[PDB]
Amino acid sequence: VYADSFVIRGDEVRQIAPGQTGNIADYNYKLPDDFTGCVIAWNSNKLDS
Amino acid sequence: FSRLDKVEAEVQIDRLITGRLQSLQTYVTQQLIRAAEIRASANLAATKM
Structure with a gap:
C-alpha cells in the first residue's frame, strides 16, 4: 500500500482520474491508465487558505 | 480510441x-x-473410377 498526497485547486480535483489531460495531469503528476486503489478528496478551505 | 476515456x-x-x-x-x-458433402461426391466418384 502506498499513500500519495498533495494539494490542488478545487477546479482541478476532477483531473486526478486516469485518462485526463491538462496542466496538472501531464506536467506535475500523472496517474497510469490501469490504476487500482482509489482517491479520497475533500475540501480544506479552513486550513490551507 | 480518440474520443473517449x-x-x-x-x-x-x-x-x-x-x-x-x-x-x-x-x-x-x-x-x-x-466439406462434409463434397466428401460424399469425393467417395462416390472414387467408385465410378
Whole structure:
C-alpha cells in the first residue's frame, strides 16, 4: 500500500482520474491508465487558505 | 480510441472484437458442412473410377 498526497485547486480535483489531460495531469503528476486503489478528496478551505 | 476515456475504452473495443470473432465462427461452421458433402461426391466418384 502506498499513500500519495498533495494539494490542488478545487477546479482541478476532477483531473486526478486516469485518462485526463491538462496542466496538472501531464506536467506535475500523472496517474497510469490501469490504476487500482482509489482517491479520497475533500475540501480544506479552513486550513490551507 | 480518440474520443473517449482510456479506462472505459476497454469494454467498447472488446464489444466489437467479439462480434467479428463470432462472425468468423459462423463462416467456418458453414464450410465444415460444405466439406462434409463434397466428401460424399469425393467417395462416390472414387467408385465410378
